[PDB]
Symmetry: C5
Subunit: 146 residues, 5 copies
């Protein structure tokens, strides 16, 4: 699968930048090197945290045109019930933005119990980088949408 003409959007939160950078990297790397996506055709915006992910994406979708978008963020279970309610709302929200707009939104949200689980899924400490998978999913959904 190659998408030389595909325009892709990547909105990521800023908390847990240690797990987030590897995630974004893998996504970009994979699209460029495996699906022939052009670097200039990849916009990368950012928002304070995961809560702003759905709106950040919705705003950008209104401005320019993209074939696919990837929402990236990591939520870690804390002492309160915050984790549970935000996770549910954000996941439901990304799903909504995608269905409302007709633009494929790939879920790059990690909802873990601790930092280790997040880093592991970002490719560190012997884990597999899930950003790569999201990159290929973006490309694939982008093409099927044409």
């Amino acid at each position: 699968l190659k998408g030389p003409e595909l325009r892709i959007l990547i909105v990521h939160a800023r908390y847990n930048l240690q797990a987030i950078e590897p995630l974004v990297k893998g996504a970009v790397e994979t699209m460029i090197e495996k699906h022939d996506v052009k670097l200039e055709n990849i916009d990368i915006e950012s928002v304070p945290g995961s809560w702003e992910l759905p709106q950040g994406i919705r705003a950008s979708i209104a401005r320019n045109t993209y074939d696919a978008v990837i929402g990236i963020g990591v939520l870690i279970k804390g002492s309160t019930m915050h984790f549970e309610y935000i996770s549910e709302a954000v996941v439901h929200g990304l799903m909504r933005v995608g269905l409302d707009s007709g633009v494929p939104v790939i879920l790059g949200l990690l909802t873990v119990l601790n930092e280790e689980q997040a880093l592991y899924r970002a490719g560190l400490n012997g884990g597999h980088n899930h950003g790569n998978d999201w990159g290929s999913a973006a490309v694939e959904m982008g093409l099927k949408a044409l």
Copy 2:
């Protein structure tokens, strides 16, 4: 119940292809052999994973016309809360696509604790193939929609 004229869509994810193939097979087999559905009248698309099921279906529904569609995928509980939030969002999303479009969407999503439970419901190891049930449900809902 026979649906010789029915056009049916089947979108399935690709993770856990071991449980997914049997599922799709049973669905197709059942429609052809028990409800007289014509093989040429059955489109089979695929997406990376369960998260893309709702959008994959919505896109296809916009292109061609179908009397019913079956969303197939299997989610397995992992170490994080991922399983819980995606399961809820995907199920809610397939329900939405169906009600929004007026096209019957049959739920072929397995949300299990482990691989064994999935294979069991795919007809292996003495279990009953649920794909068969989904096939008959598609045919029935398709006819009642006419």
Copy 3:
């Protein structure tokens, strides 16, 4: 409360027909014998399972005109998480169909732990038939809608 002119719809699933029949019976019986609903003014459709309840109702609401509708089905906790996610989606969906259409939808969905609990609520083994209650609720909501 009497509704001689009321037209009522009853869509029921087919799994657990042992608990479902008593449920439907009580609903019909109650409407006829206590609220003067005319037998000819009661349509009874059916769908494979509870998942199709929302769409089955939405389709029918589009065809003919009804003053109230009753969605009947029984979900039993199983080995997987299926029970939990379907229950939530179906209940949320019936609520949606009702609010979207303006037509009162009475919830006749039983979400139990085992078969016994269902039969008990269907009037068997010393229990009270909840179908009766749903019948009266349909009639009442139908009238208040006029």
Copy 4:
């Protein structure tokens, strides 16, 4: 805060009339005696149970015009999962009706473990009547909407 011109709607379910009456009383009493709401400007409808609360309100909102509405009902945990799914759907539904219509909907739904907890929140056995609070909330939201 005084609302002599405010028109307020109160829809309440009928199950657990022992806890419900005190609740409604407190709401009305409080509005009349503390916010100068006129008794003639307070409509009080009723529905069979909590499930019908959202639709009962939506129907009335379509007929007449109100500045605020209070949904009152009490759900008690039972032997099945019924309590959990209905509670979630009803709460989500009242929230929806309010946001869809632009009319403030005050939540007067009690979701308790047992009858005692409900009566306690209805002002009995040394508890505080929450109906009073809902009455003041209705008045306040009604005014801010003008």
Copy 5:
């Protein structure tokens, strides 16, 4: 990041004023002193409780024009299931108001187990004031929306 021209709205509930005031303070303080927001450009409304947060915001968004809004409130787990259902509905609702309007809504809702956890997140007893974070998030989302 500076937003001298930004107009920001802050709607807060009134229960737990001990935790709420510090929260609002930190938000305002941070915007003024770190992002050059003008005090006259910050409206501060209030509602009885967290349930009214979504509607309170929706009403105000309809009146005047803002670049961002912050919903502040604190919910504390009690004896009943109330906490759980309201938390979920309010969080889902704030998310909806934001996506429906196109106006960024920052979540300043604390869903804690006890009063201590709330005060801690309000900057007291050695904790970090989260109002500051919400203030910066509002400013940032406000600018990116232009």
